[PDB]
Every structure is written in structure tokens, then in C-alpha cells.
Amino acid sequence: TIPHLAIDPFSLDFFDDPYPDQQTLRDAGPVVYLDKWNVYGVARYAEVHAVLNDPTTFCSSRGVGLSDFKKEKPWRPPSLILEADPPAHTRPRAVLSKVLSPATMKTIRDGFAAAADAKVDELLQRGCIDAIADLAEAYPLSVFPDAMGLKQEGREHLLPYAGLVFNAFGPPNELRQTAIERSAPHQAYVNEQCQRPNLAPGGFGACIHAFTDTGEITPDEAPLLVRSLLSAGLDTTVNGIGAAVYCLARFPGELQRLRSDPTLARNAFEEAVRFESPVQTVFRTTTREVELGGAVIGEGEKVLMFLGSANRDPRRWSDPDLYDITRKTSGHVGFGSGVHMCVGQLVARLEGEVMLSALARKVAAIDIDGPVKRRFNNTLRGLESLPVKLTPA
Template identity: 80%
Template structure:
């Protein structure tokens, strides 16, 4: 199948499947192939364009008028097929609608609000490290990367204690659903009903604790900023954005610091590097690997002509290791200047959960570095396969007290 349009011949075609289990197990050789084949490629398997170099990924992310999100940030084109759930008012929306709803989330997750949460998050991180030091050997994913965010973020949002075991499966489902109709997506959607029901119910105003972030979102209905129908959908956006990116980010950071003991010692000798150590792990491992956009018009990108209504797959992870942009991209260096990485996206659709992720990542790495001398991987790490996310399902470790 050739690419649509007469200009397609100028775009190199590749027979690779970025949603295949073998690719998920080791994406790096394919990332290099994608970057080196050309600035824009055409992937015959799913009939879409791909960009894997930093410059083009950045360009697509920062031109929402040409590369829109409202037609879906997964492979499904909402102009041609019905979304599997009501679209996100943040991720799957364009200006001016996106501008209005995003402004509400920016207020409820402002730097001032984050500052108010810092002490609570830091105290929870210390408690988690206390428990881990007693155990000595544990799973760094379930007992740390998942347990820590789950112990604080749902409380900050104002969720009731019961039913929180739906949260991680729900977020995993959302990110699987951005992929093509492969087994991962089909299974996730087939299992989704109880998770969706829980999340829909929890996002209603009456079910949220007064004073929490969720209640603050609903308060904007009274001020006329958003409608009563939109408020629960905005709370829903935070549930996936504020949890899965954080869980995978913290998991990636611990995995990096365990594999690169010199960087761990560097962090221990300078705790002010905690935030950057987390940020560099997000660049290096890229918990969010890919996102799609849809062209709103014929466009030329780095010499390639792409027609209107085409899906463009951005390889965020490949851009984050593009040697054209990064010096020694395949090394984990906690002193690197990480600003500009696209691990949370870029531009107006940058991840809404990033402030939460950064705060949790920084507080947890600080607490660990203060009190743990070494982290040793003691068993085979296991990957959790997902159409959009890259993370571990299991990481057995043993820690040595400082």
C-alpha cells in the first residue's frame, strides 16, 4: 500500500510496527532506523506518517493548528470513527475549547498549589522510605513507584478511599487505547467497564472531598469557567495524567539509578540534583513513548509533503535520544541540561500532570538519597507492555541503609 498523494514517493517507506511486542521489548534499534531513514517516514503497516527526530517532533507538537488533537491523539480518527469514551477536554481538544479548559487546570495545579502540597508529599515519601528500609528487599515498582503516588495523589485529588485499585488499570487502559486495534488495545477495552464506571462515578462533585483538587475543578462551574458536564471530564483527565506518568517516571528513575551507581552516588552527594535526576530519567526512558496528531491541511515538513487528514505518529522517545539534539544521548547523566526534552510533550498540550510528577519524583528521590547507600537489582526486571507507555511491571531490588 503506497502512501496517499502524489508527493508520497518522496517520503521513505518502512516496514516496521511500532506497536509490536518485539518493538516494545527493545525499541532502540528501530528508533535509530526511524531517525536515520529520514526526517519524515511512512509506516506501511498502519498507513501513517512518522517523525522520530527531535526537530520534527518538536515542530509537530508546537503547531496545533496544522497538527490537531481533536481528531484523536491515538490512531483512531474521531472524524471517521466514534471515540471509545467521551474525548478528553485537554488531550483531545484544540483551541479555543482547549484554551478555556486548560486555564482551569492551570489554576488548580498552579505552582502555589504545588508548593502547598510539597510538605505533605515529602512526609509521605519519608514514610514510604521508612517502610522500605524495614523490608530491605522489595519490588521497586509495586512497593515504591506505584505505592507512593497512590498514597498521596488520590487524597490530594479528593477521592474516597475505597475502589482505588481501579486507578492504575484505568490509566493503563487509556494509554493502550491510543494504539491500533491490536491485542493490547482489544483486551484493555474489553476489561474496561468496571474501571470506567468507578472513574466516572468518582469524578462527580458529590463524591469528591471538599477542598481537594477535584472539588476545586468543580468550583469553576460556579464561576462560569466550565460547565457542569465538563467538570467531571476535567477531573478524569487528572486521574490518568497525574498517576501513570508519575508511576512510570519514578519507576524509570529508580531503574536508572540502580543501573548507574556512579549517578546514584552523585545524587547522594548533592541532593539538589533530585529533580534533575528524575527529569533525566524521563528523557532517558521516556515513560510516554508516542502520540499522534492529524493534519488539518496539506503541509510540508522538512521537505516532505503530507496531505490533509493524515495521521502523524511522533516518537517522543526517539526524539529524546536524538544525537542531533543531545550529547551522548544514550547515557544517563543527572547533571545534564534536560530542558527541552519532550517526555511530557511540548507546547499547549504539554502533560497536565507534569507538575505533580516532578514534585513526587523529586521528593521521593530526595528521601531515598538521604537514607539509602545503595540500590541493587536482585532479580530479572519485567516490562509492562502498553501501546503508549514504557515502564516496568516488576523490579526486584535490595537497598542498603546509609
């Protein structure tokens, strides 16, 4: 009843061009079985949305990667938020929500915007830049570590640790094994920066530790919740902003619309998240036998959600393969959906908005002028190098 496919969604060929195989996954049926890894897959918007919004049946405490924490040891102690279910999930989630609150955004927005304008001004002086290293990476590295309260020394561990975290969600292929092989120095740095004395006053890290006396979290929970932000808070925005610049570089018509109305910056970034879906995949584990799309999935089965495919499903979207900065993007699953929906999305959207605003006001053209190189990761989709010439407005 359930179609079996040999597609490996974690193969380099798949990463290089996932869209044909993602259509094959969608059109094979609402639920597929991936013989390569012995997991169920759902690639249509409807089933992805349904799974995300049934956390009781499709739990996260057994891991949101391929590995089932009930069968294998997690590569690191489980996250108190991402890898927890209600009710254990609820209070750690509330703390991170209050830490990354609208009030916090108001306190940091002006500095985030000034740094975005400064970076674009700097880049325009060079003209020919690499939109990854020099922008998508450089800008978040210029605001997020400081907003965390991190010291200067050791920040070079942040992106490697994030690449490790996101490769570790995948199956035990070479990408994952190599990441874990090299993990020790990055884990050691990150774990140490999670301790309260190492997080500067007023930043996100210190705010988490200050929240340890309300009865929501205890002091021994704060370090791992800092770990959550050092895991998820940087590499995601790098690939989000990279996605948006890549979109504007490829669709000059949309850059021209953005220039004509910079208030479209926030939705242009939201559309980029839908269009590229920097986070491609997430797993759940069934806690019971469950019917999904006519298939009977047993208990303790891994279910792979194709967020990027759901965000290009023509059953949900009109012209899903077009980048449209005035599209009504509400409902895309690029940030997830339901109780685990990205708790840091206000930070993500703030960075993306102020960067696209800087580009909208200061840049007239973005032309690819060198070889584009893709970056391969079991969970993240993005580029390694994006040579562009920036023409000033």
C-alpha cells in the same frame, strides 16, 4: 520520496528493545511512512518539536491516538483538554493549570515529602523490595488519590483504567482490544468519582468543580476534567518514578552523585523522564496539506511522534544514551511541548523530586537482585517488576 518502513512501533518486540528501531526510524529520514498502520512517523527531535508546536496544522481534536475521531467513534467521550484544539482547549486548560498551580503545590509539598520519606523508611526495613509495586506504584497511590479527594473504596480501579486509557491510544492490536474488553467496571468507577459530591473538600477534584462559575468552564464540564486527572495523573508518575529508580539502579555512579548533593533530585528525575520517556508516543492529525521535512503530507493524515526517540536523538543531545543527572534537560519532549505540554508537570516533578530526595538521603545502594520484567503498553514504557536490594545510608 518518503521512505516506507515495516517497523511496528506497537509490537511486543519493539517494546522489549525500541532503541535500534528508533535509530532506524530517525536515520531513514525526517519523515517516514509506517506501512503497518498507514501513518506518518517522525522520530527526530526537530520534527517532533515542530509538530507539537503547530497545533493548527497538527490538531488534537481528531484524537491523539491512532484512531481518527472523524472516521471512528472515540472509545469514550473526548477529553475536553487533551482531545481539543484552541480555542475550545484554552479555558479548560486554564482551569487545570490553576487547579495544579504553584500555590497548590505549596499546600501539598510537605505531605508529599513526608509520605516519600516514610515509604523509603518502610522499604529499608524490608531491604529486598520490588521497586515497581512497592515504590513506583505504592508511593503515587499513597498521595495522588488522596490529593484528588477520592474515597478509599474502589481505588484498585485507577491503574487498570489508566492502562486502558494508554492502551487505547494505540492501534487496534491485542493490547488495545483486551483493554477495552475489560473496561466496563473501571470506566463505571472512574466516571462516578468525577461527580462533585464524591470529591472530598480541598482536593484537586473539588477544586475543578469550584471553578465552574468563572465563565471558563460550566458545571457539566467539571466531571470530564476530573476524568482527565484520573486518566493522566497516576500511571504517568508510576512510570516516571519507576524510570528514575531503574536509572539509579543501573547507573550507580549517578546514585552516588545524587547522594552527594540531594538538590540534584529534581534534575535527576527530569533526566529520567528524558532517558526512559515513560510516554513514548503521541499522535496528531493534519488539518491541511503540509510540508514536513521535505515530505508533502495530505489533509486528514495521522502523524506519530516518537517522544522517546526525540529524547535520544544525537542531532539534539550529546551522549543521548547516557543517564546524566546534571545534564541540561530543558527542551526534552518527555512532557510534550507547546499548548498541550503536560498541565500536571508540577505534580509529576514534585512526586519525582521528593522521592529521589528521600532515596538520596536514606539509601546508599540500589542493586537489582531479581529478574527484571517489562510491562507492555501501547503508549507507556516501564517495568512490571524491578527487584532491588536497598542498602541504608
